[PDB]
């Protein structure tokens, strides 16, 4: 089965910049190759077919090229619209096969997270459950780490994380981390602390509270 390998996996870019995504096939596929776009939270839409045929309606800053096993998509002058995931497709052999995709994201200046920790509400504790929440908001770049600490010791299990897609207004990212305990466990410990580690600081941002 023809294996399609795309690079890069991810890349941040600036408006006006020139960008070149590649797709490698595991065999000569004779330009039976299509490039697909997915703008964030939207549908797949084909941009190019037979390697370099540009579908009408698609802007001329897009182009593709290559032959044999090696193929490329380039954007002359990156615009805001163009952020998204771009995929390659070979249709020379069954089963038709896709690349893993390459994510085009928007460049900007570094930002420290605003970190908040929230205790369980009165109402949740009345249902006999406890959920401690930590928002790591409006940071850049993406790469962030969170660490839970209870009474001094690190906590791994019972922790679920959610990451936003890059904000299409301010170009930042955000993460929620939630540590879900029973009321029984929650009440057996006094100190609850999340720590955010991020290339903007050489020590972490630390929010904590005490039941009291």
């Amino acid at each position: 089965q023809i294996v399609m390998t795309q690079s890069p996996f991810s890349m941040y870019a600036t408006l006006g910049e020139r960008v070149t995504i590649t797709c490698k096939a595991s065999q000569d596929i004779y330009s039976y190759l299509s490039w697909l776009q997915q703008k964030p939270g939207k549908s797949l839409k084909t941009l190019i077919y037979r390697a370099n045929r540009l579908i009408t309606g698609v802007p001329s800053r897009f182009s593709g090229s290559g032959s044999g096993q090696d193929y490329s998509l380039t954007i002359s002058s990156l615009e805001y619209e163009d952020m998204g995931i771009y995929y390659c497709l070979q249709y020379d052999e069954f089963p038709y096969t896709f690349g893993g995709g390459t994510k085009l994201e928007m460049k900007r200046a570094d930002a420290a997270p605003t970190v908040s920790i929230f205790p369980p509400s009165s109402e949740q504790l009345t249902s006999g459950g406890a959920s401690v929440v930590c928002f790591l908001n409006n940071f850049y770049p993406k790469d962030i780490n969170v660490k839970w600490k209870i009474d001094g010791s690190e906590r791994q299990n019972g922790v679920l994380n959610s990451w936003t897609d890059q904000d299409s207004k301010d170009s930042t990212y955000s993460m929620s981390s939630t540590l879900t305990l029973t009321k029984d466990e929650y009440e057996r410990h006094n100190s609850y602390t999340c720590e955010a580690t991020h290339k903007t600081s050489t020590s972490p941002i630390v929010k904590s509270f005490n039941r009291n």
Partner: protein, 221 residues
């Protein structure tokens, strides 16, 4: 030309999933092959199969067991049936149009996509809890508040703040699957001078259970 997938949003494990592609703008008995693909969560894509305009089928051999692509030429529709499904089949299915031969060369062209989720969850409304700062964490010029929407099924849920009035400084995180149910939080940030002096409430709607619920975020004193 216009393609549109339709069909249930949840199939149960080990049962068959069916989806419909209705074509307008073009005839399915005329020309082209009529395809299904899917996008799993984590975004990897896969071609499942097609039915030619002459009714010949080609199926990705990884599915050969469980796939069946058929068509009603009366109503210009074609069908995917995926049998004996499990969780890995939870994906966003797209129908699509490709050339059947190599010349004349045809663009591949996709429909809209439609999510279908594999699961046995019954339909459950969310519990909504306020997220307010410990009394008192350190104040700055701004303060962040939230809403925890726990234990609901299925998706989606929509969170707003003071109905529409708080567009700015808002994020809702994507849902995560806790234990066969979904959970998320929304964050809002407002000048700390204006809270608590002005009330801040989250309105959460869960349309698959005809649920709306409002939570006022009150200081924890």
């Amino acid at each position: 030309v216009q393609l549109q997938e339709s069909g249930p949003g949840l199939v149960k494990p080990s049962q068959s999933l069916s989806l419909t592609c209705t074509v307008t703008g073009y005839s399915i008995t005329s020309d082209y092959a009529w395809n299904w693909i899917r996008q799993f969560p984590g975004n990897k894509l896969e071609w499942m199969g097609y039915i030619s305009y002459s009714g010949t089928t080609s199926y990705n051999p990884s599915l050969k067991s469980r796939i069946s692509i058929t068509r009603d030429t009366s109503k210009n529709q074609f069908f995917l049936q995926l049998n004996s499904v499990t969780t890995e089949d939870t994906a966003t299915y797209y129908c699509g149009r490709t050339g059947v031969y190599r010349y004349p060369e045809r663009a591949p062209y996709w429909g809209q996509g439609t999510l279908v989720t594999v699961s046995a969850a019954k339909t459950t409304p969310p519990s909504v809890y306020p997220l307010a700062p410990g009394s008192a964490a350190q104040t700055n010029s701004m303060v962040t508040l939230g809403c925890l929407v726990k234990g609901y099924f299925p998706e989606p849920v929509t969170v707003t703040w003071n109905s529409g009035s708080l567009s700015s400084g808002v994020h809702t995180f994507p849902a995560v699957l806790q234990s066969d149910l979904y959970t998320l939080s929304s964050s809002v940030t407002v000048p700390s001078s204006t809270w608590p002096s002005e009330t801040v409430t989250c309105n959460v709607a869960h349309p698959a259970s005809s649920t709306k619920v409002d939570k006022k975020i009150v200081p924890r004193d």
